[PDB]
Design an enzyme around this catalytic site. Structure first.
Site, PDB file in Angstrom:
ATOM      1  N   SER A 195      44.886  44.493  55.732  1.00  0.00           N
ATOM      2  CA  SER A 195      46.237  44.351  56.254  1.00  0.00           C
ATOM      3  C   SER A 195      47.270  45.134  55.455  1.00  0.00           C
ATOM      4  O   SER A 195      48.349  45.410  55.986  1.00  0.00           O
ATOM      5  CB  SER A 195      46.623  42.873  56.295  1.00  0.00           C
ATOM      6  OG  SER A 195      46.441  42.273  55.027  1.00  0.00           O
TER       7      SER A 195
ATOM      8  N   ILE B 291      44.166  50.845  52.789  1.00  0.00           N
ATOM      9  CA  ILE B 291      42.790  51.264  52.986  1.00  0.00           C
ATOM     10  C   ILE B 291      42.027  51.114  51.676  1.00  0.00           C
ATOM     11  O   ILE B 291      42.607  51.002  50.589  1.00  0.00           O
ATOM     12  CB  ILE B 291      42.668  52.704  53.525  1.00  0.00           C
ATOM     13  CG1 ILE B 291      43.177  53.716  52.497  1.00  0.00           C
ATOM     14  CG2 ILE B 291      43.450  52.840  54.833  1.00  0.00           C
ATOM     15  CD1 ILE B 291      42.726  55.141  52.774  1.00  0.00           C
ATOM     16  N   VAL B 292      40.704  51.081  51.810  1.00  0.00           N
ATOM     17  CA  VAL B 292      39.772  51.014  50.689  1.00  0.00           C
ATOM     18  C   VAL B 292      38.957  52.293  50.696  1.00  0.00           C
ATOM     19  O   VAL B 292      38.372  52.658  51.723  1.00  0.00           O
ATOM     20  CB  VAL B 292      38.847  49.787  50.785  1.00  0.00           C
ATOM     21  CG1 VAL B 292      37.842  49.765  49.628  1.00  0.00           C
ATOM     22  CG2 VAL B 292      39.665  48.511  50.810  1.00  0.00           C
TER      23      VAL B 292
ATOM     24  N   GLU C 278      36.285  47.766  40.515  1.00  0.00           N
ATOM     25  CA  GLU C 278      34.832  47.801  40.530  1.00  0.00           C
ATOM     26  C   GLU C 278      34.349  47.887  41.983  1.00  0.00           C
ATOM     27  O   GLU C 278      34.975  47.339  42.891  1.00  0.00           O
ATOM     28  CB  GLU C 278      34.321  46.552  39.790  1.00  0.00           C
ATOM     29  CG  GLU C 278      33.244  45.717  40.402  1.00  0.00           C
ATOM     30  CD  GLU C 278      32.921  44.467  39.561  1.00  0.00           C
ATOM     31  OE1 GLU C 278      33.801  43.581  39.388  1.00  0.00           O
ATOM     32  OE2 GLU C 278      31.785  44.376  39.065  1.00  0.00           O
ATOM     33  N   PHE C 279      33.294  48.674  42.219  1.00  0.00           N
ATOM     34  CA  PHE C 279      32.744  48.856  43.561  1.00  0.00           C
ATOM     35  C   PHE C 279      31.564  47.902  43.730  1.00  0.00           C
ATOM     36  O   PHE C 279      30.584  47.985  42.976  1.00  0.00           O
ATOM     37  CB  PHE C 279      32.315  50.310  43.791  1.00  0.00           C
ATOM     38  CG  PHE C 279      31.479  50.521  45.043  1.00  0.00           C
ATOM     39  CD1 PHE C 279      31.993  50.243  46.298  1.00  0.00           C
ATOM     40  CD2 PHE C 279      30.183  51.011  44.955  1.00  0.00           C
ATOM     41  CE1 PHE C 279      31.235  50.438  47.446  1.00  0.00           C
ATOM     42  CE2 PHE C 279      29.413  51.214  46.096  1.00  0.00           C
ATOM     43  CZ  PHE C 279      29.932  50.926  47.346  1.00  0.00           C
ATOM     44  N   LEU C 280      31.661  47.004  44.713  1.00  0.00           N
ATOM     45  CA  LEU C 280      30.598  46.053  45.028  1.00  0.00           C
ATOM     46  C   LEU C 280      29.784  46.611  46.184  1.00  0.00           C
ATOM     47  O   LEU C 280      30.307  46.783  47.288  1.00  0.00           O
ATOM     48  CB  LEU C 280      31.155  44.676  45.390  1.00  0.00           C
ATOM     49  CG  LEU C 280      31.269  43.849  44.107  1.00  0.00           C
ATOM     50  CD1 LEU C 280      32.499  44.283  43.356  1.00  0.00           C
ATOM     51  CD2 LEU C 280      31.264  42.360  44.345  1.00  0.00           C
TER      52      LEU C 280
ATOM     53  N   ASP D  11      44.721  34.531  50.669  1.00  0.00           N
ATOM     54  CA  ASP D  11      44.031  35.245  51.740  1.00  0.00           C
ATOM     55  C   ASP D  11      42.522  35.031  51.659  1.00  0.00           C
ATOM     56  O   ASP D  11      41.728  35.960  51.813  1.00  0.00           O
ATOM     57  CB  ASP D  11      44.368  36.736  51.752  1.00  0.00           C
ATOM     58  CG  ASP D  11      44.187  37.344  53.138  1.00  0.00           C
ATOM     59  OD1 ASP D  11      44.149  36.569  54.119  1.00  0.00           O
ATOM     60  OD2 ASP D  11      44.069  38.577  53.256  1.00  0.00           O
TER      61      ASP D  11
ATOM     62  N   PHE E 145      43.411  40.216  46.409  1.00  0.00           N
ATOM     63  CA  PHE E 145      44.453  39.361  45.857  1.00  0.00           C
ATOM     64  C   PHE E 145      45.860  39.823  46.206  1.00  0.00           C
ATOM     65  O   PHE E 145      46.811  39.388  45.552  1.00  0.00           O
ATOM     66  CB  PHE E 145      44.321  39.279  44.330  1.00  0.00           C
ATOM     67  CG  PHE E 145      43.224  38.382  43.859  1.00  0.00           C
ATOM     68  CD1 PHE E 145      41.901  38.762  43.976  1.00  0.00           C
ATOM     69  CD2 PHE E 145      43.519  37.163  43.274  1.00  0.00           C
ATOM     70  CE1 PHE E 145      40.888  37.936  43.536  1.00  0.00           C
ATOM     71  CE2 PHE E 145      42.513  36.325  42.831  1.00  0.00           C
ATOM     72  CZ  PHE E 145      41.189  36.718  42.956  1.00  0.00           C
TER      73      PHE E 145
HETATM   74  C1  LIG Z   1      37.688  46.414  46.291  1.00  0.00           C
HETATM   75  C2  LIG Z   1      36.214  46.692  46.626  1.00  0.00           C
HETATM   76  C3  LIG Z   1      35.624  46.802  47.870  1.00  0.00           C
HETATM   77  C4  LIG Z   1      34.248  47.064  47.650  1.00  0.00           C
HETATM   78  N1  LIG Z   1      33.165  47.254  48.572  1.00  0.00           N
HETATM   79  C5  LIG Z   1      33.361  47.399  49.965  1.00  0.00           C
HETATM   80  N2  LIG Z   1      34.542  47.218  50.498  1.00  0.00           N
HETATM   81  C6  LIG Z   1      34.717  47.383  51.963  1.00  0.00           C
HETATM   82  C7  LIG Z   1      36.114  47.193  52.500  1.00  0.00           C
HETATM   83  O1  LIG Z   1      36.729  48.167  52.889  1.00  0.00           O
HETATM   84  N3  LIG Z   1      36.709  45.889  52.494  1.00  0.00           N
HETATM   85  C8  LIG Z   1      35.978  44.734  52.010  1.00  0.00           C
HETATM   86  C9  LIG Z   1      36.926  43.791  51.302  1.00  0.00           C
HETATM   87  N4  LIG Z   1      38.105  43.586  52.091  1.00  0.00           N
HETATM   88  C10 LIG Z   1      38.871  44.793  52.178  1.00  0.00           C
HETATM   89  C11 LIG Z   1      40.159  44.545  52.887  1.00  0.00           C
HETATM   90  C12 LIG Z   1      38.066  45.802  53.004  1.00  0.00           C
HETATM   91  N5  LIG Z   1      33.687  47.710  52.803  1.00  0.00           N
HETATM   92  C13 LIG Z   1      32.426  47.896  52.249  1.00  0.00           C
HETATM   93  C14 LIG Z   1      31.391  48.229  53.083  1.00  0.00           C
HETATM   94  C15 LIG Z   1      30.043  48.428  52.470  1.00  0.00           C
HETATM   95  C16 LIG Z   1      29.881  48.284  51.175  1.00  0.00           C
HETATM   96 CL1  LIG Z   1      28.313  48.520  50.490  1.00  0.00          CL
HETATM   97  C17 LIG Z   1      31.015  47.927  50.261  1.00  0.00           C
HETATM   98  C18 LIG Z   1      32.238  47.756  50.820  1.00  0.00           C
HETATM   99  N6  LIG Z   1      34.028  47.112  46.307  1.00  0.00           N
HETATM  100  N7  LIG Z   1      35.231  46.884  45.669  1.00  0.00           N
END
Ligand SMILES: Cc1cc(Nc2nc(C(=O)N3CCN[C@H](C)C3)nc3ccc(Cl)cc23)n[nH]1
Length: 293
Positions: free
Chosen positions: A33, A36-37, A98-100, A142, A161
């Site tokens: 909202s 972008i990520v 950190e990337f999950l 949220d 957050f």
């Molecule tokens: C901060 C962060 C995000 C992340 N991994 C991910 N975030 C998002 C994504 O764009 N999201 C999910 C959380 N809600 C956000 C509004 C939008 N999509 C993913 C799709 C596949 C895989 Cl494998 C990992 C993702 N790692 N660290």
């Protein structure tokens, strides 16, 4: 104008400089909202990171941008996604995190049934995070499946957050209408003074997500859903007769309209439903295969 004021103030709380001095190959992987990520690579490390980008001019509540960068700075908790740095790039706030690599809980909920060991494991992780945050006066505001991220080995961490708030002895309650409609607590929709209990209601809605595959009222227009949340009895599981009495009893303590009688995160950690909580290994299969409800 006030945008230039806000931008200067935000610049005072972020790290200085342009992270394009060390990050390469930005790729957008998602959105929410507020922005972008992306993923990006550290030029020296080969390390992958996530970068959230938020345009200051597109925020309905730009002052909320301060909260995450400030409140969650240097926050270290095993069930919270770590924030590394933040920058002001033009009119955008960039937050390096950190990337999950397991993606978000939403992708699990839409593609597979979860058993109660797995649901309990997710609830336990989120409640461990919320118990500490709530004790420190932080309200997330949220909570929903898209805010929950997974590692490849099945660990669960709370993210997103950007709507969070800090309460204190002097100002113990907020009244702002903040969140995502279908997950909003009724007292928050009503703009009544509220505290950390709103996160517990939202967590109850996320349990309905995990059991039913979607929150209540999901294809209703969001303003109509909010009126129905504000005015009706707490929502019911579609799959009510498919869950254990322990799960139902647990949910009954989350979806309580009166915030004073709704359970706290610390109380919920003692609930017997969470004795079912599986280890990270129990979550792994949910990211590798699908099973219909
Ligand atoms: C901060 C962060 C995000 C992340 N991994 C991910 N975030 C998002 C994504 O764009 N999201 C999910 C959380 N809600 C956000 C509004 C939008 N999509 C993913 C799709 C596949 C895989 Cl494998 C990992 C993702 N790692 N660290």
């Amino acid at each position: 104008s006030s945008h230039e004021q806000f931008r200067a103030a935000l610049q005072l709380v972020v790290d200085p400089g342009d992270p394009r001095s060390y990050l390469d190959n930005f790729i957008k992987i998602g959105e929410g909202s507020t922005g972008i990520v992306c993923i990006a690579t550290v030029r020296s490390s080969g390390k992958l990171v996530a970068v959230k980008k938020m345009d200051l001019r597109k925020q309905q509540r730009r002052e909320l941008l301060f909260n995450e960068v400030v409140i969650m700075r240097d926050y270290q908790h095993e069930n919270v996604v770590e924030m590394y740095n933040s920058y002001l790039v033009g009119d955008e706030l960039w937050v390096v995190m950190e990337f999950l690599e397991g993606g978000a809980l939403t992708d699990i909920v839409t593609h597979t049934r979860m058993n109660e060991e797995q649901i309990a494991a997710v609830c336990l992780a989120v409640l461990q995070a919320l118990s500490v945050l709530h004790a420190q006066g932080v309200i997330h505001r949220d909570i929903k499946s898209d805010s929950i991220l997974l590692t490849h080995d099945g660990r669960v961490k709370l993210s997103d957050f950007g709507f969070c708030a800090q309460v204190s002895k002097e100002v113990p309650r907020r009244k702002s209408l903040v969140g995502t409609p279908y997950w909003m607590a009724p007292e928050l929709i009503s703009r009544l003074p509220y505290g950390p209990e709103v996160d517990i209601w939202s967590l109850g809605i996320m349990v309905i997500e995990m059991v039913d595959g979607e929150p209540p009222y999901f294809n209703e227009p969001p303003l109509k859903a909010m009126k129905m949340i504000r005015d009706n009895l707490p929502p019911r599981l579609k799959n009510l007769h498919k869950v254990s009495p322990s799960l139902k009893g647990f949910l009954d303590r989350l979806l309580v309209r009166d915030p004073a009688q709704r359970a706290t995160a610390a109380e919920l950690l003692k609930h017997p439903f969470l004795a079912k909580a599986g280890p990270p290994a129990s979550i792994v299969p949910l990211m590798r295969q699908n099973r219909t409800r």
